[PDB]
Ligand binder design. Structure first.
Ligand SMILES: [Ca+2]
Lengths: 394, 16
C-alpha cells in the first residue's frame, strides 16, 4: 500500500541514478509506492513529454521526471519536475534545479525527495538527515567506532575510535554534537564531542555507571542516568552552568531517558513495577507516572517530535518487537517483525524508525515506517552495529 | 564486560 507515484529515471552512464534514490526515499517513508521501473508506461525526460492519461490509467496522479547535466568544470546540474497526472494534468506542482559536485549527488536526490514528499504530504522531509551508531569491528587496537552516515546507510564516516566499549550516542538538537558513553578511562564516562573539530567536553564520570544521554530539544539540558547511589537514577545537567540536578531517587533502576517536546518532561525505563515499563516525570516536581500498560514489558522509548506518540520495545506474550504507542489513548501498534529487536530511534518527522536486530547476525540496522507498511535492512557494515540515533533536521 | 548493572536495559552487557 501507500500512494502510488511515478518516479522516472532522470535524463542524462550517468554518475548516479537520481530517480532510483527518489523512489527508494519515498518508499522508505511508507507513504508512497513508486511504480516498478519495468512497468513504467513511458520514460519522459521532461515535463512536456509526460502523457498524463497513461499514468492516470494506472492509478498514478503524480510523476517525477528530471535531468542530470555535466558542467564543464566537472560539477553537475540536477533538476526535477513534479508533474500532475490527476486533476490538473500536465501542470508542474514543484520543481528545482541546483548544481552539485559528484560527491553530493546522493544529496541532490535526497533534496528532490524531500521537496516532492513535502509538496504531496505536507510533512517536512527527512531524507537529508543522518544516523549515528557504534560499530564493533574485528580490528584489535580500536575495536569500537562511533560512526555517522546518511539515514539510508551511505556516506559513512568515523567520529571516534576507541580501544574500549562505546554506547548510546545522542545528537544535539542543532546537529553539531554527539553525546556518548565511553569506557576508555577504564570505567564509564559521559562525553560530548563536537563533530566539526572533534573536541571533547567531559560531562560526568561518577562512581559506577554514567550512561544513556539525551539532549533536550531546546538545547539547554542533557539528561542521563547515574548509578552512584546504588541503583540507576536520572539526572539533568544545565549545559550553560554545568550544574546537575537529581530527577529520580529510589531504590529501583531508572534509565534510558527521552525528552517530550517541552524540554521539561522525560519518558524513561524503570524496573519499579518488576519487569521494565515506561514512566514519565517532570525534571522539577519529581514523582514518576507509569504510562505503558499493554503487553507484559515495555522499554527504551523515543517520543516523537510532536509529542503525539512514542516508539519502544514492547513484549506481549513472548515476542519483543518495535512498537508505537499513542500517548493520548494508550493504543499500541506493533511495527517490526524481525528477531532481537532493540534500541529504536525516530526520524525528525516521525515517519521512519531505525533500530537494531538479528538481520546479518548483528551487522545490519533496519528501517521500519511508523505506519508499519515498509521494512528494509540497511547496507551491511563490517562489524556488529548497535545504538542507532536518528539526527535532528539538518 | 561493560555494563550498567541493570540486568535488563540496552546498556546491560550490550557487547557480550
Ligand atoms: Ca533509547
Amino acid at each position: 500500500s501507500g500512494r502510488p507515484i511515478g518516479v522516472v529515471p532522470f535524463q542524462w552512464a550517468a554518475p548516479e541514478d537520481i530517480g532510483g534514490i527518489v523512489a527508494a526515499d519515498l518508499r522508505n517513508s511508507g507513504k508512497f509506492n513508486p511504480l516498478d521501473r519495468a512497468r513504467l508506461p513511458q520514460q519522459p525526460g521532461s515535463a512536456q513529454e509526460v502523457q498524463p492519461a497513461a499514468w492516470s490509467a494506472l492509478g498514478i496522479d503524480a510523476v517525477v521526471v528530471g535531468q542530470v547535466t555535466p558542467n564543464p568544470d566537472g560539477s553537475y546540474n540536477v533538476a526535477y519536475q513534479l508533474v500532475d497526472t490527476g486533476g490538473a494534468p500536465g501542470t508542474v506542482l514543484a520543481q528545482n534545479s541546483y548544481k552539485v559536485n559528484k560527491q553530493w549527488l546522493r544529496y541532490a536526490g535526497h533534496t528532490a525527495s524531500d521537496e516532492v514528499f513535502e509538496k504531496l504530504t505536507g510533512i517536512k522531509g527527512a531524507f537529508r538527515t543522518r544516523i549515528a551508531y557504534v560499530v564493533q569491528t574485528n580490528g584489535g587496537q580500536f575495536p569500537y567506532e562511533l560512526r555517522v552516515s546518511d539515514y539510508d546507510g551511505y556516506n559513512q564516516f568515523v567520529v571516534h575510535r576507541s580501544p574500549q566499549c562505546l554506547m548510546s550516542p545522542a545528537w544535539s538538537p542543532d546537529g553539531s554534537k554527539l553525546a556518548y558513553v565511553t569506557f576508555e578511562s577504564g570505567r564509564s564516562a559521559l562525553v560530548i564531542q563536537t563533530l566539526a573539530n572533534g573536541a571533547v567536553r567531559q560531562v560526568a564520570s561518577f562512581p559506577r555507571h554514567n550512561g544513556a544521554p539525551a539532549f533536550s530539544p531546546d538545547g539547554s539540558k542533557l539528561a542521563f542516568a547515574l548509578s552512584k547511589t546504588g541503583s540507576l537514577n536520572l539526572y539533568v545537567m544545565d549545559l550553560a552552568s554545568g550544574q546537575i540536578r537529581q530527577v529520580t531517587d529510589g531504590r529501583s533502576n531508572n534509565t534510558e531517558p527521552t525528552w517530550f517536546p517541552d524540554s521539561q518532561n522525560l519518558a524513561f525505563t524503570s524496573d519499579q513495577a518488576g519487569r521494565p515499563q515506561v514512566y514519565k516525570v517532570n525534571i522539577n516536581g519529581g514523582a514518576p507516572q507509569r504510562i505503558t500498560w499493554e503487553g507484559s514489558q515495555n522499554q527504551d522509548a523515543d517520543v516523537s517530535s510532536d509529542g503525539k506518540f512514542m516508539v519502544m520495545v514492547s513484549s506481549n506474550g513472548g515476542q519483543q518487537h518495535i512498537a508505537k504507542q499513542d500517548l493520548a489513548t494508550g493504543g499500541v501498534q506493533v511495527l517490526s517483525s524481525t528477531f532481537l529487536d532493540e534500541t529504536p530511534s525516530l526520524a525528525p518527522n516521525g515517519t521512519m524508525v531505525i533500530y537494531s536486530s538479528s538481520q546479518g547476525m548483528g551487522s545490519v540496522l533496519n528501517l521500519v515506517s511508523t505506519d508499519g507498511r515498509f521494512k528494509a535492512r540497511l547496507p551491511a557494515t563490517d562489524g556488529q552495529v548497535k545504538f542507532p540515533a536518528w539526527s535532528p533536521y539538518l | 564486560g561493560c555494563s550498567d548493572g541493570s540486568g535488563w536495559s540496552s546498556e546491560n552487557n550490550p557487547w557480550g
